[PDB]
Amino acid sequence: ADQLTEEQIAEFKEAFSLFDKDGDGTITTKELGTVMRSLGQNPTEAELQDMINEVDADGNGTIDFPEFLTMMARKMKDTDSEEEIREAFRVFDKDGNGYISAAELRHVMTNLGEKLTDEEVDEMIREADIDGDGQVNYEEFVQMMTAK
Amino acid sequence: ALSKDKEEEIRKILRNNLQKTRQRLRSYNRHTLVAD
Amino acid sequence: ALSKDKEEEIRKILRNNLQKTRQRLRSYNRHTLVAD
Numbered sequence: 001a002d003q004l005t006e007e008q009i010a011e012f013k014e015a016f017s018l019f020d021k022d023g024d025g026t027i028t029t030k031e032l033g034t035v036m037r038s039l040g041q042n043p044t045e046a047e048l049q050d051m052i053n054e055v056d057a058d059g060n061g062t063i064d065f066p067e068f069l070t071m072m073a074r075k076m077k078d079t080d081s082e083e084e085i086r087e088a089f090r091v092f093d094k095d096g097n098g099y100i101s102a103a104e105l106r107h108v109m110t111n112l113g114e115k116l117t118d119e120e121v122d123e124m125i126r127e128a129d130i131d132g133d134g135q136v137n138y139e140e141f142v143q144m145m146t147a148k
Numbered sequence: 149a150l151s152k153d154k155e156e157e158i159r160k161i162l163r164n165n166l167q168k169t170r171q172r173l174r175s176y177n178r179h180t181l182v183a184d
Numbered sequence: 185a186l187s188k189d190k191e192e193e194i195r196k197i198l199r200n201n202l203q204k205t206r207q208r209l210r211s212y213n214r215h216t217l218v219a220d
């Protein structure tokens with residue numbers, strides 16, 4: 001659904017290049033430290049090791065481009081958030097049929113303490129019904145929850 | 149076990165689209181009159 | 185062949201990441217010095 005554009009990815013690749021001054025495809029403490037020193041920053045050796053260690057998700061001792069991609073993407077390292085998302089589905093999917101129907105949505109809206117017509121629910125479901133299968137799937141629900 | 153804050157965010161998202169949906173729905177009130 | 189402005193942005197990019205690690209380092213201070 002949400003993917004980085006080519007322009008953003010190109011900038012990301014350029015950013016890796018910014019840290020990877022030697023262009024060997026590998027960024028190490030010496031290169032990272034040099035980049036920070038070039039920026040006028042003066043980090044300690046322990047801090048430099050900590051910077052790599054903290055973002056070294058694969059623990060291969062180095063920061064690869066994928067690691068940098070998520071690193072500069074400011075992605076949360078809390079993977080337990082998936083459980084929270086799953087719990088939201090469980091709450092909405094009261095009947096546990098794996099799908100959210102208009103009736104199930106109506107109950108959620110009803111619990112808000114407001115009275116709405118079935119047509120309004122149907123229209124809301126219809127708008128969020130990207131596939132038009134008359135039901136709201138996980139992907140469709142995610143779009144609804146990521147709606148801003 | 150969703151937190152209240154998380155639930156509130158969910159409600160705000162739904163509330164936000166509900167208001168937009170309601171506005172569009174109320175727009176069709178013009179065509180709810182078939183009397184002539 | 186990027187403008188210096190892009191290079192300047194790295195300072196902000198590194199500073200943001202640096203602060204996060206610095207805060208983690210700060211948390212170790214709490215474990216060695218605590219009072220109540």
Ligand SMILES: [Ca+2]
Nearest residue numbers: 020024026027
């Ligand atoms: Ca390198």
Ligand SMILES: [Ca+2]
Nearest residue numbers: 056060062063
């Ligand atoms: Ca690594």
Ligand SMILES: [Ca+2]
Nearest residue numbers: 093097099100
């Ligand atoms: Ca269901």
Ligand SMILES: [Ca+2]
Nearest residue numbers: 129133135136
């Ligand atoms: Ca559907």
